[PDB]
Design a protein around this ligand. Structure first.
Ligand SMILES: CC[C@H](C)NC(=O)c1ccccc1CN(C)Cc1ccc2c(c1C(=O)O)OC[C@H](CCC(=O)O)O2
Ligand SMILES: CC[C@H](C)NC(=O)c1ccccc1CN(C)Cc1ccc2c(c1C(=O)O)OC[C@H](CCC(=O)O)O2
Ligand SMILES: [Cl-]
Ligand SMILES: [Cl-]
Lengths: 149, 150
């Protein structure tokens, strides 16, 4: 499971925050986009896969699963595109709790930037560095390193 | 040196490609921007530091070094902003060759996307995954993991 990621789309301020979660570590990357389209999702995945060894992505909905733009990007980047059906029901709850936590952090920083995109990157930073004791940023690196070796 | 990064700005197609290189591994992140400004650089560093444990950034030029916008982002993210003076002359050459390699890869993929930004992300992917043997992506993770066990 070092290579498995989950996509997650949440809304704030009339915009969309697209999140990718590294399932085993809870590490995240995120971006603000005007709306979820296949093209936005495809580009986001392309970025993610150039930065981390992304083997599998559990897509966030059926439209992204279906999208030929998303499929083409997964093909290009060597990603196995899978559904995100919560066969383990605890997955829904974990995602919902992460979205709530992220929005809480965005609120706490919202004053330290004019633009939502900046606040979201601040939120990513705080989420990934938070010791819960190791941080998510530490866990993902350790997981992948162990896999390499 | 697990935490040291170097900024690098190169130009293509009338646009600017801002690159951050993890010095010890050669791993990179990059984005296309219309022009280098303090604000663009500040935002790029904010992104980078939320994703990797960035201790020190050797800035690419004196304007970004001076920039109060860049300084504010570095303060926020806990980054030590340093100059990028190549006291070791090997550094100019390493960056130049990287820019040349990246532009080559962009040309090789240029036909697989309408937009330069897409091609640049494809170039990042190819650069980071290229086995030279380990890839830069493998080296950065090994370097940081080794550091964390300290
Ligand atoms: C960042 C941490 C510091 C402590 N906060 C402040 O100094 C601060 C605090 C409150 C209000 C304004 C500011 C000043 N601003 C300039 C912060 C900023 C930097 C880069 C950006 C921004 C923003 C933004 O205000 O959101 O917005 C997106 C933009 C995208 C790239 C591009 O378009 O160039 O990059
Ligand atoms: C990508 C790999 C595949 C094999 N290549 C093609 O299928 C392909 C090949 C040639 C020409 C057009 C295409 C089709 N396009 C749609 C590729 C694409 C996807 C997401 C993007 C793009 C682009 C783009 O063409 O550059 O541009 C930036 C945009 C930014 C996010 C936003 O604005 O939504 O995200
Ligand atoms: Cl981190
Ligand atoms: Cl990689």
């Amino acid at each position: 499971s070092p290579g498995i990621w989950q996509l997650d789309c949440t809304h704030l301020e009339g915009k969309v925050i697209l999140v990718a979660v590294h399932v085993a570590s809870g590490y995240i990357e995120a971006e603000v986009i005007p709306a979820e389209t296949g093209q936005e999702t495809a580009y986001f995945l392309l970025k993610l896969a150039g930065r981390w060894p992304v083997k599998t992505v559990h897509t966030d909905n059926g439209s992204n699963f279906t999208s030929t733009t998303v499929k083409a990007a997964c093909w290009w980047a060597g990603i196995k595109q899978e559904d995100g059906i919560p066969y383990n029901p605890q997955s829904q709850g974990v995602i919902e709790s992460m979205n709530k936590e992220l929005k809480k952090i965005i609120g706490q920083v919202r004053d330290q930037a004019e633009h939502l995109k900046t606040a979201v990157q601040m939120a990513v930073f705080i989420h990934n560095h938070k010791r819960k004791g190791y941080s998510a940023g530490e866990r993902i690196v350790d997981i992948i390193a162990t896999d390499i070796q």
